[PDB]
Amino acid sequence: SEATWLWIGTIGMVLGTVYFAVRGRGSTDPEQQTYYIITTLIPAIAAAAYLAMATGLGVISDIYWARYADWLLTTPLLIIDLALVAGARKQTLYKLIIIDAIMILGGLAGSMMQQGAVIRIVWWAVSTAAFIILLYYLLGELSERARSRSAETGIVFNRLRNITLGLWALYPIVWILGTGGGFGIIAVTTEIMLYVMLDIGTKIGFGAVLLESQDVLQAA
Ligand SMILES: *C/C=C(C)/C=C/C=C(C)/C=C/C1=C(C)CCCC1(C)C
Ligand SMILES: [Mg+2]
Ligand SMILES: [Mg+2]
Known part of the structure; x- marks a missing residue:
């Protein structure tokens, strides 16, 4: 019963990516260009992973490789976006x-x-x-x-x-309560649904807020 939620996540990520890409055109300053490239690349990778999971790939018998690959790829991009906004040093x-x-x-x-x-x-x-x-x-x-x-x-x-911290703090609870790497308190389908909602948040809402505030960030 998880194919429905996997396809919901797929379509949501696709819509987010298309929206970010349509917003990207016409960018002038290279910093805005970095912001647009990263903020559009995150949901695109998410959509690819979700489509993989939904079509019989993405899961290996006992293991889910597409979710962890998506995470390993996309979480550093969000970190990079935050550091660029804050202007942190490269070592940090x-x-x-x-x-x-x-x-x-x-x-x-x-x-x-x-x-x-x-x-x-x-x-x-x-x-x-x-x-x-x-x-x-x-x-x-x-x-x-x-x-x-x-x-x-x-x-x-x-x-x-x-936004980032509040949304990120919930992934380990889903992990520890789920069936995979967990105690089976919640079933697989509830786990996947909650991951879909968390991903919608962390990827599309954060990107919207970031790309909305680019004008005030330049004028400072
Ligand atoms: C775009 C994807 C995001 C924001 C997901 C990030 C995932 C995490 C912050 C998950 C972290 C975990 C722990 C804190 C400990 C238990 C295992 C994980 C991977 C679920
Ligand atoms: Mg994700
Ligand atoms: Mg997230």
Whole structure:
């Protein structure tokens, strides 16, 4: 009963991507061009992964490879967008990308490690530790940096950061409650539906807010 929700996610990502692409044309400043390329590439990768999952690919018997591939690809792009908005140094960005990659890779270790019970909980704990480190990172240095560019930049970055963090904090709960790498409290179809809603949020809503605020970010 999950094909319906996979196709819903597919169509939603497709609409988001087409909308972002139509918004992209006519861009002048190269920074806006970077914003448009990244913000359109994220939902396109998501749509490709969702179409793969919906058409008999994407899942291997016991494992879901398309979701984790999409995550490994797209989460660094969102981090890059946030850092560009805040103007963080390249070293901080490398740190953030490595920490996020470690988080997703730990999540994938739990989806594939299904021998006992404590081993997935340990993988979830360490990946959530990496998540908490990223949370600490986004609230501290990046916010002070964005405020150091200007106050409008600070407010815009705070809105983007609130959206990002609030939406990202729910993925590990879905993971720990689901059937894959979890305890089976919720079924597979509810897991996929909640992932679809979270992806709609984190990819289309964030991109809309970012691309709406480009005029005020330049004038500061
Ligand atoms: C566009 C895709 C997004 C925003 C999804 C990101 C995924 C996560 C933040 C998930 C993180 C996890 C943990 C914090 C620990 C348990 C395993 C994961 C991968 C579900
Ligand atoms: Mg996603
Ligand atoms: Mg998300």
